[PDB]
Symmetry: D2
Subunit: 120 residues, 4 copies
């Protein structure tokens, strides 16, 4: 299922536990950006997905502050888990940096990350 | 913290009750005015618990999976934004709403938008 | 058409002069108030030239590459939105700004935002 | 270069001409959605990209109306062209449908398309 260790196309590591009632909890390590070591993540997922072959909707957040660095930014990933032989989490994400009100127009990056359980 | 903690409404008439923990945790409950949903949903998120003191906003994000004891939309929204404090406190966000889809329909699985939250006294 | 055609400003103070052609073409010129840019830039786009008469907006989009005779930011913005006609005409958009990057930096190549355009008499 | 026939991961066909001064002009055929046959596209690209190995920024629009169908919607793709042995156009896109003002909150889909010159 969702619980396990995942890796995206950047080489980032996503270690997540899926709770019975819809909680996502875990640890993120990014291969890129103003960051080092582990960061706390929390999110939610659909704990009773539809039985028609549809993916499982989910989302999580990392605020990019830990004991080593603070980038003054946070990323949310929104996506779906697709099970089967080669499980995937396909996401699109938003990274917002803290900015002045005048710089808010350029505060948010958008991207997409695909996660698999295969180590780089 | 006490700044983020409280009751917020957005331009749709949705309501967001949140507690900002000392460790960077956001926890609480969301009621949407719109969509395939009713009653309260669990929210969880993170925020920068040591922001820049330079008049920059405080980065944060949270997610809601649209399943509670009453309804399941098979979808989830993440909001990514910043808290701007002061007398007229705001949380300015962009969001992604992803629905569970079949592989054939995954290309149209995700909506994008923007919500502005005003804190309620 | 004559509805879309004209001069528009957004909440940044940017200006958008456009002509909507009978064939669905949008053509004109954009001045941004912000970013790595100055003077006028070429815009080109498309719009639904036979929209629903049901009080739905008119879907459209346009792009600007931020290169003119004066400056090159090595970037381009696309706006995707709808025109809402009437006495207080608006074009409501979401946009993506992509900068040319090296492969190592492609993950942070794209900004997202939202602009509201008001038509000027 | 950019001029040529491209295909994305959905099987859509993108036939584009890149003009000397930054114009993109061409024809789009989609493998998915409320659409059939060719649609007109126009866009722009950076006609003097940086000489440091960076991709070429670009964007284009299709309004999903032709002689066969009208979906009352338009898509913009924003991205960069990456040249070399296996050229790519990597994009993220926004699809806005015409809606009432009250339904505007759910009017815009976001996604990502990767284009190559390889026929399906
Ligand atoms: C979202 C992207 N995917 C990923 O695995 N890491 C990127 C995010 C890194 C951000 C680091 C904090 C910063 O530079 O602001
Ligand atoms: C993100 C939008 N802002 C908001 O307050 N609610 C909208 C989301 C509602 C979605 C309800 C479940 C569904 O329809 O999929
Ligand atoms: C899309 C935003 N809205 C707007 O009027 N201009 C902004 C874009 C300006 C970008 C200028 C070139 C650059 O900085 O890359
Ligand atoms: C952007 C997606 N990529 C693609 O090649 N086609 C999709 C768009 C199809 C939209 C068809 C019109 C509609 O259904 O509204």
């Amino acid at each position: 299922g969702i619980t396990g260790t995942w890796y995206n196309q950047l080489g980032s590591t996503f270690i997540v536990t899926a709770g019975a009632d819809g909680a996502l909890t875990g640890t993120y390590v990014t291969a890129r950006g103003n960051a080092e070591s582990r960061y706390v993540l929390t999110g939610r997922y659909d704990s009773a997905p539809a039985t028609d072959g549809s993916g499982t909707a989910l989302g999580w957040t990392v605020a990019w502050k830990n004991n080593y660095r603070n980038a003054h930014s946070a990323t949310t990933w929104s996506g779906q888990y697709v099970g089967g032989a080669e499980a995937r989490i396909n996401t699109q994400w938003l990274l917002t940096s803290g900015t002045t009100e005048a710089n808010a127009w350029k505060s948010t990056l958008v991207g997409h990350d695909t996660f698999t359980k295969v180590k780089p």
